[PDB]
Design a binder for these strands. Structure first.
Lengths: 125, 198, 84, 242, 92, 96
RNA sequence: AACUAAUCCUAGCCCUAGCCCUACAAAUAUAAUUAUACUAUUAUAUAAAUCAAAACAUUUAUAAAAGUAUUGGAGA
RNA sequence: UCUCCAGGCAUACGCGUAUAACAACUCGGAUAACCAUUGUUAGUUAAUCAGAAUAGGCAAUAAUCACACUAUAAAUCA
């Protein structure tokens, strides 16, 4: 869940449960060359790597072995017609290696007459 | 932003209204929702224009410019598909008609009779002719997308008709979070310590 | 067509929570396909599907919020979930 | 544009609307009413007429009150209307002499006075005039209660007045504890100043204090809509039964 | 440079109600038994209705009439303008 | 989690969210709905509607029978305090 | 009849009149916009001068009676 | 491939996408080729690299390969 307030925890407090999840993730073909089991994901910047591990294991029942994540800086060089800098939204790329010996491969999605010129052919005269 | 025949936000619209354009705005007399009486499918008579005096059915209404489009009327001929290889193909393209250029037609007597808005027994607003008072029923227009609701067949991820119509909500003294707990049997005995809200 | 608010209200509290994930799963798949399309520089087939799912998800959230808001007002009379 | 009401009328509008309108009428009357302080350093003109210099004819005259500065320390003490006079002086009382910047300081003192109503001795900043006024008032407690706010010229004195008025109003046993017979005599002795409890609470309260007090009075925990509907449902059903 | 396009044609009606009724009741005082002075019919700023003065006098009269209702920014600007006007007329 | 002394991270299990995933087996609701299905006119639920649907029938029967009193207001569904519930209506102490 | 250029009317404003006013989430004064402890927390004396007195010094505006009288380096 | 020149690589600081690929040839490089330019898309992966409890009791003797050895500028929480 993103853009929401999380309950503050105190000693002896309840375990944190998210009944409704606002996190939305996208599977992306790796830009770089990565092992087949490794999978690249674009996830909200507020999500932690542990959250992805629980997210895949619970929502999608996907076994995960290892996770590596990076934060990509959004270029702000772009300017509008008014010369106002435009900032690309920052996104987080997560490299997730499958467990139990599972392997992943990106699906192949999106698999007149020439002799008489200048006289319109309509004329029969 | 000058509204044109091209739909707003289209590629043609962008050419018509580029970001740097500062042309003199076109002034169009405001028309209230109650005042407006022309709707798609309405048979109307063209008061003035190329096809003045020819009655047609409305197919598009750009209320921002008070424009009414009649299919097969006020239709000029233009070249579609103009390219380097081929000159293009002549096609008949309709031109916008202003609201004052058309008037509603009484069904029994075909004339440009001025109309006044009045409710009916059912409560639906219907235009009534000022003279020879009569009810002009709202015309039937086909769905723009072309999808007939009855003919539509559920595709993948589309609920069946009965499933959508089923009602399962039971009013009770429990929130959704509590309701989910009962079904899945979530129980928590831990308690948050006192927090001073401020 | 996307889920309307009234139909979601007819559905039970447990059903609403179940439906939210179903819509979310479709939204992620459509989002997953769209991002690949951006990488491939290709259009997304039937982009209206994502809009329909988002509209359904938005309707779900308010319906659930309505039930929570009503009970909070009844038991406490507070018009806002957060003290202020 | 131009403001329909002048700036001075802006305050009146606020007083007449909002929480200010909801303030108690007795407190509002006390705030609204203004009483001129008793002259101390200036006397009214002896004659009511004088020869107008410009036209050479007899004309009516007016009185100009002398400017006196009352420091906030006076509001924390009991000054008998005395105050600091800041201005210029001419040596030897002739305008032909040099002008010297002079600040005139009345002789100030801190002394202890016994309050019968509060049964405690308070050490406070006081002047000789106040002590004479206390004797003229027939007691320190009488002086605080009898003297008006402007003549009293002390916020603490008003604070004493609020406590004294409330104490008399409530017939509180706190006065002279373990001596009920003595308590009755004090109340009888100061019976003239007995007033309703509500009025005494707001005596001497500052504007900021008054606004907070009214806000505290009017703030109430939100009513659970369940309770409101329950009462409404019961009331409607009860009417139907009739 | 000069216009290359014609201005829109304009026709003015000299017998409109405003022009036709212009000046009516200008003799209210003499023809109304002098109950109402013609100065009472003047419409304009309050401080100069039935009164005339130089620019300095007009500004000063404006300050007195609406000084209590004037904005602080306007009042401050008027004081500064008055000071410049006062020096020029009374010393030059 | 919480960072303890020595600049050492100590993950707190309680503060780590647990994703409650519903069971979608046998669930007939899907991401999209039929065009055959008529659109639903919005009728947002309100405290009055919730009270009328559930609480009103109980009080109405009880009031006619005369078995109504302040102490039994909780019987009809009033909660004196939100403490003891995992999800507290006010102050909101639970996430979506 | 050519190039460079030029052409235009609304973008809007000004003064009176009238009118007082009472118009998402998330984060924030800590280092503002940093989801929870640190470290207590806080504006303001005549307005002056410039300026006028051709410098400069007391001084220098900020309905009728009437610019009459007084005051003033009796001068602005 | 040949001829010749000889401060190179990491970190800090600063900069903030100038990085890489594709597509363009108008503008930027004080000329071209080519891009550092224009448009679009991609990118930098860390338990090891880097950043982000309390109250009492008690301490004489520098370093310099610290041993000898001296010196003066007087130099170590547990």
């Amino acid at each position: 869940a993103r853009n929401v307030l999380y309950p503050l925890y105190q000693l002896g407090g309840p375990q944190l449960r998210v009944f409704r999840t606002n996190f939305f993730i996208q599977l992306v073909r790796p830009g770089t060359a990565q092992p087949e089991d490794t999978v690249q994901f674009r996830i909200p910047m507020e999500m932690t790597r542990v959250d992805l591990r629980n997210y895949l294991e619970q929502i999608y029942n996907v076994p995960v072995a290892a996770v590596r994540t990076r934060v990509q800086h959004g270029s702000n060089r772009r300017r509008d017609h008014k010369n106002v800098r435009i900032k690309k939204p920052d996104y987080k790329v997560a490299y997730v290696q499958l467990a139990h010996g599972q392997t992943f491969t990106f699906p192949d999605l999106f698999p007149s007459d020439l002799r008489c010129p200048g006289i319109p052919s309509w004329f029969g005269l | 932003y000058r509204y044109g025949m091209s739909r707003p936000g289209s590629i043609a619209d962008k050419r018509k209204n580029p970001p740097w354009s500062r042309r003199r705005p076109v002034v169009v007399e405001p028309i209230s929702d109650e005042d407006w009486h022309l709707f798609c499918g309405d048979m109307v008579e063209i008061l003035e224009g190329k096809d003045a005096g020819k009655q047609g059915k409305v197919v598009q209404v750009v209320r921002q410019r008070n424009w009414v489009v009649l299919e097969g009327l006020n239709t000029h001929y233009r070249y579609i598909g103009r390219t380097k290889d081929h000159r293009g193909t002549m096609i008949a393209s309709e031109a916008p008609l202003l609201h004052h250029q058309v008037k509603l037609v009484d069904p029994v007597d075909r004339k440009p009779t001025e109309i006044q808005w009045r409710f009916t027994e059912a409560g639906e607003r219907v235009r009534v002719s000022t003279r020879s008072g009569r009810i002009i029923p709202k015309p039937e227009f086909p769905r723009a997308d072309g999808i007939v609701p009855e003919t539509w067949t559920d595709g993948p991820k589309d609920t069946s008709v009965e499933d959508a119509l089923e009602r399962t909500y039971v009013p009770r003294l429990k929130t959704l979070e509590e309701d989910v707990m009962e079904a899945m049997g979530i129980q928590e005995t831990r308690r948050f310590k006192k927090v001073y809200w401020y | 067509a996307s889920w309307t608010c009234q139909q979601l209200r007819n559905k039970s509290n447990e059903d609403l929570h179940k439906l939210w994930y179903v819509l979310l799963k479709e939204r992620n798949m459509l989002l997953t396909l769209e991002q690949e399309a951006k990488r491939q520089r290709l259009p997304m087939p039937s982009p209206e599907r994502l809009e329909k799912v988002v509209d359904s998800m938005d309707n779900v959230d308010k319906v659930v919020q309505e039930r929570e808001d009503a009970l909070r007002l009844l038991q406490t009379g507070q018009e806002k979930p957060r003290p202020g | 544009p131009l403001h329909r009401y002048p700036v001075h009328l802006w305050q009146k509008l606020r007083l007449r609307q909002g929480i200010c309108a909801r303030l108690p009428a007795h407190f509002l009357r006390s705030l609204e009413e203004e009483r001129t302080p008793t002259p101390v350093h200036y006397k009214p003109h002896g004659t009511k007429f004088k020869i107008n210099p410009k036209n050479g004819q007899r004309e009516r005259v007016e009185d100009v009150p002398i400017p006196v500065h009352y420091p906030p320390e006076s509001q924390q003490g009991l000054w008998g209307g005395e105050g600091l006079i800041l201005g210029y002086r001419y040596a030897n009382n002739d305008k032909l002499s040099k002008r010297v910047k002079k600040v005139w300081k009345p002789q100030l003192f801190t002394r202890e006075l016994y309050s019968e109503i509060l049964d405690k001795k308070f050490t406070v900043t006081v002047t000789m005039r106040t002590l004479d006024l206390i004797d003229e008032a027939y007691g320190f407690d009488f002086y605080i209660l009898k003297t008006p706010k402007e003549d009293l010229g002390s916020k603490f004195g008003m604070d004493l007045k609020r406590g004294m008025l409330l104490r008399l109003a409530r017939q509180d046993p706190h006065l002279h504890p373990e001596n009920p017979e003595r308590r009755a005599a004090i109340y009888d002795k100061y019976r003239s100043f007995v007033i309703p409890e509500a009025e005494a609470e707001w005596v001497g309260l500052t504007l900021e204090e008054a606004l907070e007090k009214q806000r505290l009075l009017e703030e109430k925990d939100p009513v659970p809509l369940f309770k409101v509907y329950v009462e409404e449902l019961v009331q409607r059903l009860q009417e139907q039964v009739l | 440079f000069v216009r290359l396009t014609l201005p829109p044609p304009k026709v003015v009606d000299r017998w409109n109600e405003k022009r036709a009724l212009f000046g009516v009741y200008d003799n209210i005082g003499i023809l109304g038994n002098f109950e109402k002075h013609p100065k009472e019919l003047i419409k304009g700023p309050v401080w100069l209705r039935g009164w005339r003065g130089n620019e300095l006098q007009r500004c000063v009269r404006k300050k007195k009439f609406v000084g209590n209702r004037m904005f602080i920014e306007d009042l401050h600007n008027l004081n500064k303008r008055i000071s410049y006007l006062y020096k020029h007329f009374n010393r030059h | 989690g919480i960072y303890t002394s020595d600049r050492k991270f100590v993950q707190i299990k309680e503060m780590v969210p647990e994703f409650v995933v519903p069971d979608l087996t046998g669930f007939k609701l899907k991401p999209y709905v039929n065009y055959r299905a008529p659109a639903g006119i919005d009728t947002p639920l309100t405290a009055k509607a919730l009270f009328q649907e559930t609480v009103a029938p109980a009080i109405e029967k009880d009031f006619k029978e005369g078995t109504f009193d302040a102490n039994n207001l909780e019987k009809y569904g009033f909660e004196p305090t939100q403490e003891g519930k995992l999800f507290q209506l006010y102050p909101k102490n639970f996430p979506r």
